[PDB]
Design a protein around this ligand. Structure first.
Ligand SMILES: Nc1ncnc2c1ncn2[C@@H]1O[C@H](COP(=O)(O)OP(=O)(O)O)[C@@H](O)[C@H]1O
Ligand SMILES: Nc1ncnc2c1ncn2[C@@H]1O[C@H](COP(=O)(O)OP(=O)(O)O)[C@@H](O)[C@H]1O
Ligand code: BEF
Ligand code: BEF
Ligand SMILES: [Mg+2]
Ligand SMILES: [Mg+2]
Lengths: 330, 417, 100, 50, 210
């Protein structure tokens, strides 16, 4: 039987996604489940099946504790001083040997455990490999655009997910196109696809500029703020700590060429490079531009800003659902 | 029942005891399983069993307590120890353990430990509060080792020559450069006798690698010390195993504030074993030597030092030359600028039957000012200046002939003026 | 290719395959009422290139068994009973399975 | 010789008696497992009525 | 908490601090993972952590900040740095970095850098506007190094001999040709003492191999 175990551990399909010690622990867990299904009672068994060459030599766990419930895995602290245990937990002794690791039900449960383990393997591997590209934009065709979320093929058995809440009624989907974003959260302890990528976050566009805008990335300029009402308005507020560059003149390109390109990349969303100031007053003055404001007031105890607008430029002051204001408050 | 008691017994006494117990013929099999079976019987009907030895950690987590009379070999004599001890008392590779044992139950064949009585001749409570080995602060030789007995027999003069050629202290690294057939064996024997006679307080250990069994037998029953050795009828695995175990034992013992002095003969055979046991890393040197094959021998040699916090470790390893191979020269060249106490034995003097054949001109000790007083070291300098312009054979001729009449070394210094 | 008695039977649920052991033969003392499987015979209806790696992969992963045709013998329709003994004869050279 | 005289005691003394190894101890502790009672109890009504 | 503070502490003081924290016996293991575990605890309950060292770039893009007291060795003491720093401040092999660090989260074992406070004892802004090494214009020795102290002790005379045998200046290449057992060790020791006493402004480094 040991020869078959060695053949199995050697001829695994994914030698890179399922490392050798992982095969060892998977076989150990499978044999543990087999031995559990063997006896009528509930007794957990560790295997440690001679990792390199030899066969199995099982054990018997006993869980040192003053309890008695399920006495198969019970050893009281007072009645444990023999065998030189002397401890309070970890009495995994070799009281049990002579397991059968090949019969029908054992082989079936071992195949099932192996499937679960290779799935867990693939998951952890793809997640902790493609998680390095969390701040930078990822590429890849979609697996399937379901209702609650969409799943995207990032490459060799590589998968990501984009949630439904971050989607748009006008943003448009079917298996086979590639939609990008920013990997915003990774939950490696989940039960399935755990590579969560969003598209509505502001820093997205910032990262986007880091691919196109050469002024950003070298710290010579400073992209500070990004007000993003997805589908409505995506404005950016940058700052220049140097003394030979313009905040809006350089990053705009040549009469709406690079900003228009990244707008079409973001979905044709209206993008206006705004210039924030060191004070919130001029900041909200510029965020609601081009328009006039009859009153700018700041309130700290209320955590609010009163912006009263004059009449004459309403068509540029409110817009749709107060979008020109909705970014500022956001 | 103590294990070391049945250990120091010859095989005939074990046979007589087994026949007194009235069992199957035990004289037919190994001393190992002889002791195993008599212990199994006497423990079926007998007290708590007691045992002692040195511990080695396995890659499974558990450990094996083995005996030095079996040169720390695997067999039924070993004592199984669980990783729970290595968590509770946090056991280590090379700990001198002594405690209570019992027979193995159903299906087991190794005696199980019950309760540690002495860990490195010390308290387990005090076994926690200890200092790490490489975490120590090494220092130069501070206390000198007195090798002169003062009787002046036919062989003691040999040691006296060392006392004026290259003084040794606790924490010093000694390296002996000698071709075959030069009389280094009884050189180490006389040195061991002198340092065991003058200092019975420091635990003294010798190491023989790829040596003939005759010298092993005659040494393991003539001097004091756990005389552990490795004969050439075993592969490099056993030799490197003895290396590991005794070096770890010495490390733990100096960590317990004890002066350990290790006698190795020879370091070249041990390094050859290291080379033939280590896997090839692609880089070959002249003579089939790996670059990584000298890393562990260098570790073994450099483990010796003089601790500031307490205790010391002094190693005296011998090196072979002039025997023809490529490995001997490459190893001796690699180890030349490592030790701070060279002792050169020229065969050109041994061919004339002038013993001991010591190259006094090519020998010396760095930092020798911290071992002798001002006038002692001054007399050493004056005598070195006197004897240096002379040749080799005539130099040792004059040295031995003038040390023959006078009997104490300071008296020799006085009469040399 | 020669036919084998492996327990690799596709296009059938695990419940119907529970009556057999790992070698594909029903346990001694397992009653059967209707038409059910009792000997797991499969024959290769295709070509060569059936590697042992592919064998061990198909048992755990992969698509269905390509060339089997489900040549396994089932108990005839209507007849029931309880199996009490099994006999196997092997041509020399062929290694005996676990039940033999 | 009575189950009521064995339920009201722990196995710390079982291993004290020689020839009480892995077979006997596990068998005893598993037979009572199928019976629900626990090895080592506290009852004062003993023995009624013997 | 500064790393170099626990670095200059002996092992006994680390043991005492770990026992004051009330944990598993830390004296049992390496100084490396001793400092690692005490830092993990004190950072579970403690301020921002601070650290310093020299950076080495790996072939994966990331970098390791290591300590010279460990002679720039790999171990749990190291500080992981992302390639994003090596793009933003454009980090380099051998930069003396000092900045804020934090414990590693789930599954990680290397302390992560937060914000570079000093790059080569200098500003990161000024770390950009720098000159390349081989792009420099070398020159002969212009300023001489004064090795004579003026006290004339038993060993200082040794240095004085050098001052009349082979004068050294900043930018000079010195090569010592000596057989074994010639007294070069304390020769370098006296030279280092003299150049450290006379010039505490130039950073002085020694190298011992084998
Ligand atoms: N102190 C001594 N007195 C008399 N003979 C000696 C003395 N030392 C060495 N010898 C001679 O030298 C030989 C030593 O043999 P051996 O131990 O094999 O030398 P080595 O150990 O140098 O190979 C012996 O035959 C012995 O006669
Ligand atoms: N300035 C000095 N005064 C007195 N003795 C010295 C002086 N310099 C060297 N020595 C002597 O020379 C030896 C130098 O030893 P070592 O440092 O090993 O030399 P090297 O470094 O050349 O091998 C010492 O034993 C010491 O007694
Ligand atoms: F023992 Be001899 F020096 F070969
Ligand atoms: F070997 Be010495 F230090 F020149
Ligand atoms: Mg000899
Ligand atoms: Mg020197």
């Amino acid at each position: 039987m040991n020869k078959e175990i060695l053949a199995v551990v050697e001829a695994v399909s994914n030698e890179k996604a399922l490392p050798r010690e992982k095969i060892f622990e998977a076989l150990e867990s499978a044999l543990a489940t087999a031995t559990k299904k063997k006896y009528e009672q509930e007794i957990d068994v560790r295997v440690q099946i001679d990792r390199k060459s030899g066969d199995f030599d099982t054990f018997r766990r006993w869980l040192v504790v003053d309890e008695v419930t399920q006495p198969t895995k019970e050893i009281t602290l007072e009645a444990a001083r023999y065998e030189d245990e002397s401890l309070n937990l970890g009495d995994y002794v070799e009281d049990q040997i002579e397991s059968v690791t090949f019969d029908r039900i054992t082989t079936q449960t071992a195949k099932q455990v192996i499937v679960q383990k290779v799935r867990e393997a693939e998951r952890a591997m793809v997640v902790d490999q493609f998680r390095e590209h969390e701040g930078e934009i990822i590429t890849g065709v979609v697996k399937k655009v379901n209702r609650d979320n969409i799943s995207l093929d990032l490459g060799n058995n590589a998968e990501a997910v984009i949630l439904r809440e971050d989607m748009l009624p006008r943003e448009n989907f079917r298996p086979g196109d590639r939609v990008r974003g920013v990997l915003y959260s990774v939950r490696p302890e989940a039960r399935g696809a755990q590579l969560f990528v969003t598209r509505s976050k502001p820093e997205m566009l910032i990262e986007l500029f880091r691919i196109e805008v050469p002024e950003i990335g070298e710290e010579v300029i400073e992209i500070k703020a990004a007000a993003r009402d997805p589908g409505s308005r995506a404005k950016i507020a940058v700052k220049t700590n140097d003394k030979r560059i313009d905040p809006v003149g350089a990053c705009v390109g040549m009469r709406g060429a690079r900003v228009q390109a990244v707008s079409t990349e973001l979905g044709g969303e209206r993008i206006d490079i705004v210039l924030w100031d060191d004070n919130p007053a001029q900041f909200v003055i510029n965020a609601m531009a081009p328009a006039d404001v009859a009153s700018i007031v700041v309130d700290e105890d209320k955590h609010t800003m009163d912006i009263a607008v004059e009449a004459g430029n309403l068509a540029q002051a409110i817009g749709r659902n107060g979008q020109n204001v909705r970014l500022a408050s956001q | 029942m103590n294990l070391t008691e049945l250990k120091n017994t010859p095989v005939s006494e074990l046979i007589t005891l087994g026949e007194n117990m009235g069992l199957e013929n035990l004289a037919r099999m190994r001393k190992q399983d002889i002791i195993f079976a008599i212990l199994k019987q006497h423990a079926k009907s007998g007290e708590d069993i007691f045992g002692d030895g040195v511990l080695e950690i396995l890659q499974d987590g558990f450990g094996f307590l083995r005996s030095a009379d079996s040169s720390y070999l695997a067999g039924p004599d070993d004592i199984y120890v669980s990783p729970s001890q290595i968590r509770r008392f946090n056991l280590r590779t090379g700990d001198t353990i002594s405690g209570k044992i019992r027979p193995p139950k159903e299906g087991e064949r190794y005696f199980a430990l019950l309760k540690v009585n002495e860990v490195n001749f010390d308290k387990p409570e005090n076994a926690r509060n200890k200092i790490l080995f490489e975490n120590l602060t090494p220092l130069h030789a501070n206390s000198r080792l007195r090798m002169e007995r003062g009787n002046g027999s036919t062989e003691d003069l040999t040691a006296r020559v060392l006392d004026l050629a290259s003084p040794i202290g606790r924490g010093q690294r000694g390296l002996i450069v000698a071709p075959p057939k030069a009389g280094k064996t009884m050189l180490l024997q006389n040195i061991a006798q002198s340092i065991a006679y003058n200092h019975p307080d420091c635990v003294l250990m010798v190491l023989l690698i790829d040596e003939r069994p005759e010298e092993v037998t005659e040494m393991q029953r003539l001097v004091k010390g756990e005389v552990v050795a490795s004969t050439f009828d075993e592969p490099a695995s056993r030799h490197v195993q003895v290396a590991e175990m005794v070096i770890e034992k010495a490390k733990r013992l100096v960590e317990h504030k004890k002066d350990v002095i290790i006698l190795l003969d020879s370091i070249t055979r041990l390094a050859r074993a290291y080379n033939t046991v280590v896997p090839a890393s692609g880089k070959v040197l002249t003579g089939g030597v790996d670059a990584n094959a000298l890393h562990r021998p260098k570790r073994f040699f450099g483990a010796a030092r003089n601790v500031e916090e307490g205790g010391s470790l002094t190693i005296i390893a011998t090196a072979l030359i002039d025997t023809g191979s490529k490995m001997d020269e490459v190893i001796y060249e690699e180890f030349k600028g490592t030790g701070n106490m060279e002792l050169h034995l020229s065969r050109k003097i041994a061919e004339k039957r002038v013993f001991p054949a010591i190259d006094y001109n090519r020998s010396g000790t760095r930092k020798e000012e911290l071992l002798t007083t001002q006038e002692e070291l001054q007399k050493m300098w004056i005598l070195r200046k006197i004897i240096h312009p002379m040749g080799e054979i005539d130099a040792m001729e004059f040295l031995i002939n003038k040390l023959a009449m006078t009997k104490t070394n300071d008296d020799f210094f006085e009469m040399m003026k | 290719g020669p036919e084998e008695i492996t327990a690799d039977i596709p296009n059938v649920g695990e419940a119907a395959l529970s009556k057999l052991d790992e070698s594909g033969i029903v346990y001694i003392g397992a009653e059967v009422t209707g038409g059910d499987i009792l000997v797991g015979k499969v024959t290769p209806k295709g070509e060569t290139q059936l590697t042992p790696e592919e064998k061990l992969l198909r048992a755990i992963f992969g698509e269905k068994a390509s060339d089997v045709k489900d040549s396994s013998l089932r108990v005839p329709n209507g007849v029931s009973g309880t199996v009490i003994d099994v006999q196997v004869f092997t041509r020399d050279g062929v290694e005996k399975d676990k039940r033999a | 010789h009575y189950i009521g005289d064995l339920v009201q005691r722990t196995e710390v003394e079982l291993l004290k008696t020689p020839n009480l190894g892995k077979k006997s101890l596990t068998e005893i502790k598993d037979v009572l497992a199928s019976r629900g009672l626990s090895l080592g109890m506290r009852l004062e009504n003993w023995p009624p009525a013997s």
